[PDB]
Design a protein around this nucleic acid. Structure first.
Lengths: 91, 103, 77, 60, 44
RNA sequence: CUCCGGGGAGGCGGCAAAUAUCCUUUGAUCCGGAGAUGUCUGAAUGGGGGAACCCACCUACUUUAAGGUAGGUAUUGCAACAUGAAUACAUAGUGUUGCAAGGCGAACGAGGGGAAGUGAAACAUCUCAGUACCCUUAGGAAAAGAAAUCAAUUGAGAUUCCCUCAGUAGCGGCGAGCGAACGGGGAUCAGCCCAUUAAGUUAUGUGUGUUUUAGUGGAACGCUCUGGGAAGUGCGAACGUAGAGGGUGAUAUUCCCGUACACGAAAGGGCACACAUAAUGAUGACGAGUAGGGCGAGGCACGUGAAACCUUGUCUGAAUAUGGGGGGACCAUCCUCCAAGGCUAAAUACUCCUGACUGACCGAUAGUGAACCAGUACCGUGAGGGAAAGGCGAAAAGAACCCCU
RNA sequence: GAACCCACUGUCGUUGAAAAGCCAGGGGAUGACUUGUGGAUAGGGGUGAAAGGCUAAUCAAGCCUGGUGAUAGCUGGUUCU
RNA sequence: UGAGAAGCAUGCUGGAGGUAUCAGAAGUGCGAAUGCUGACGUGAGUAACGACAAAACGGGUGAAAAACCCGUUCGCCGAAAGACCAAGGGUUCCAGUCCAACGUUAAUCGGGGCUGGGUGAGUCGACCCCUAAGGCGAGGCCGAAAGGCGUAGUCGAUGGGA
């Protein structure tokens, strides 16, 4: 759990209707994370960097879309999301 | 025989041959001179930034070989050479040898 | 493979030639077989795969000399 | 900035490394949230980390 | 009617795959020929 | 990303404009040299596996929970050391440490195997042809090489390549076809050793010479007509150790980049010469299961022929300088050479590559399959097969605004 | 006698809905039965309750690339005055 | 204009190259080869529009409605024309917006174009432990070479294990 890895674990928040509803209602934060991050790594990174207490972490991977722009075909990268539940009322 | 960004030049070929101005920019083999080689752009109105379009006028670049440095002493076109005076390399007029008058 | 340890003889190629002079590929094989020799200096039997010409050379020069010569060429005997 | 970092010692360099990494993460999160106009500081920090690592390798 | 191609990924990989080609000498020559020709895909 | 050198007003790679933010005379972008970093698969080498994935162990440090960093852990061969059966000594076996190897790549070299279509106006000997193809393995070249060689006025003098000799002498179901040598003229030239061991070669380090990887300076033209635009018309000048080439709104030695010429290297590399320190040549000391012979095959231009000479699968088997080999069956005489141990440059073969230059070679159905995002699209389970598609304008100045829809 | 596995008769279809089918009838349907997944056998070879059948819509000797521009006393074609 | 293959002059278009004479070299002349590549005809606005389960009307939107949406009626399947899993496919899933091409007709609709979202596991499955047929295989045996087979082992579900 070195600090360099802890800083590379989290990438950014997710802005969407589902994420906003979860945040407003159930104390759940949605993050984009590194594709190789584990649940324990995400938990420790969140605890160290945001000063909160984590109950459990749920993760999912969505494969990148393949689109044809111009005459060439390209593919986007895979994305991993983390649903982090905070204890009581936090953040 | 370089030409720089602040020089006073005179056009030696083209539709505007015989006129002079101040160099505005130099990129690759093309040069823009203030107040010469004007073109009319039909700018379409821009949706995202407003600022409705219209007919505007702006300068267009010429080939660098079509302009020549202007010699302030004689008001004639001239070529440019290099001379090592003191320890600094300097641009000189080829016709007379005087150092180029920085403007 | 069919190689003699003492002489290095191995199968070669040749022709069958008929009375009408038809030619066909064939092989010539060595007179190979296994034999055990008593090595006195080591008090043991050494098994070699060799030809009858190899046996004649062994009778001429002695077994220990041939064994030393073979060990000189990196053979494990 | 390279000479400024080179005048420094090893302990100070290894402290500045962690500080710059924390600042880089903060900048990334700020940009991802969207309250950032200038992005050149991200590149500045990204190059600073590389400079510090190069100097550390040179010194050790 | 039943046609000739009945796909199965495991069978495809075990018959025509990279390690299958690497296991034999003739398969290594197949890979050498495709590298020489410049194929963008070496194996299925 | 860092250091050194060059350069001196712009720059933030292209498709691909513009925007926005920036960097830069406190030396940017860029060019050359030396470093730093360098995920995963792949000989892949910790075990496995459906390539880019799954699962581990050991040690040192570090964390406080279920970890992190760094290193190590393949096989085979050789050397040393340890240990160790049947079995008493031993040996086999087992283990540790150190060193080396494996894979890829155009052609050329050397070796181990080796066709058929076709021709013979059919076809089996013969030809095709030791070709195509498969396998193993070097080097910048490889192989060969210093006479047990030729010749036949008693002369030449190691190997390799080219011209002649010559389509000759021969071989051949004497068919179709195959096809020398001696001698002469050239290219290049070189010999040295077998146990106290030579020439030579390869590495290492030093010292000289040469070259290479950025670069700097570099002459000299004005009027006039046509024209959208002058480099074109007419008149008169200049430079030339520079009238090669490319660009510029049409055709330029004097407009631009350059050209002849002169100058230039912090650092780094190549070649050559001399010196020094290793290694190697070198398990080899004059050549016995060898020369020769019987049987079966192969190679020699030479198909068993009057068939010498070379290699050997099988069976045998000398003399040893008062000796032995060859001179195309064989004998005698003459001449010539010394096998059964080695090393050796050049002249010769080739082009995946890098630089410069050239063409009575092509100009988009041509030239590479491919001038364009091509071994791609597409076809096939797979090996594999395999396209079409260049051109606005000098400059986007790429058509504001109005009208029908 | 349904599912399932077959394929005896007829009409239609034959530039088809389909490079072997639909419809109406037909046979077996606890067995020498039908079927999924994963394996083995490779070309003068395999496999065959045997038809020269099958071996990727290809079989009296599969497909691909090489020898190869095989050979053809045969057929066609061969460009201005 | 000449006996011919052809030559000469000139109007329009076009917008930068062409080339006498005499020599020299050839990828030097096309109507045919069921020749090769591209473009375009005739048949001809002809056949056909893919199960004979079936449609009708009112309102809405829209440039336009037999086919879209809402509503009221009618008909069809119901051991599959309904609901799931594996294999195979890979974004076809949901929302907004567009109608050139695609859809055997039109389309405002769509599995079509563009933009943005969506897959949450100690208990489900895989991974993991174990092995079948079979594969590979340290040493080993055999073989011109490439290689064949095989011991100890190590893999391999379609089977056993909370």
């Amino acid at each position: 759990m070195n600090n360099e890895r802890i800083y590379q674990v989290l990438k950014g928040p997710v802005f969407s209707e589902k994420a906003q509803v979860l945040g407003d209602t159930a104390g759940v934060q949605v993050f984009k994370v590194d594709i190789n991050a584990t649940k324990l790594e995400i938990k420790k990174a969140v605890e160290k960097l945001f000063g909160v207490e984590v109950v459990k972490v749920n993760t999912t991977i969505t494969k990148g879309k393949t689109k044809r722009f111009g005459r060439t075909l390209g593919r986007r990268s895979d994305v991993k999301k983390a649903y982090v539940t905070l204890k009581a009322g936090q953040d | 025989a370089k030409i720089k960004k602040g020089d006073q030049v005179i056009v030696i070929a083209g539709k505007e041959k015989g006129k002079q101005g101040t160099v505005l920019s130099v990129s690759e083999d093309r040069v823009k001179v203030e107040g010469l080689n004007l073109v009319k752009k039909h700018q379409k109105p821009n949706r995202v930034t407003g600022a409705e379009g219209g007919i505007v006028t702006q300068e267009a670049s010429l080939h660098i070989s079509n302009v020549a440095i202007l010699n302030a002493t004689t008001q004639k076109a001239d070529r440019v050479g290099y001379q090592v005076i003191d320890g600094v390399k300097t641009r000189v007029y080829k016709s007379t040898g005087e150092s180029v008058a920085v403007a | 493979s069919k190689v003699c340890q003492v002489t290095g003889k191995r199968p070669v190629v040749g022709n069958n030639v008929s009375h009408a002079n038809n030619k066909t590929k064939r092989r010539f094989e060595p007179n190979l077989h296994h034999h055990r020799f008593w090595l006195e200096s080591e008090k043991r039997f050494v098994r070699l795969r060799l030809t009858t010409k190899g046996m004649r050379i062994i009778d001429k020069l002695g077994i220990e000399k041939v064994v030393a010569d073979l060990r000189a060429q990196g053979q494990k005997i | 900035k390279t000479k400024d970092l080179r005048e420094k010692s090893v302990e100070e360099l290894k402290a500045l490394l962690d500080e710059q990494q924390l600042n880089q993460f903060r900048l990334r999160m700020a940009k991802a949230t969207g309250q950032l106009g200038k992005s050149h500081e991200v590149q500045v920090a990204r190059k600073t980390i590389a400079r510090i690592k190069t100097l550390l390798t040179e010194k050790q | 009617m039943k046609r000739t191609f009945q796909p199965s990924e495991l069978k495809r990989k075990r018959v025509h795959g990279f390690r299958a080609r690497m296991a034999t000498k003739a398969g290594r020559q197949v890979l050498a020929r495709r590298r020489a020709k410049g194929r963008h895909s070496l194996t299925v």
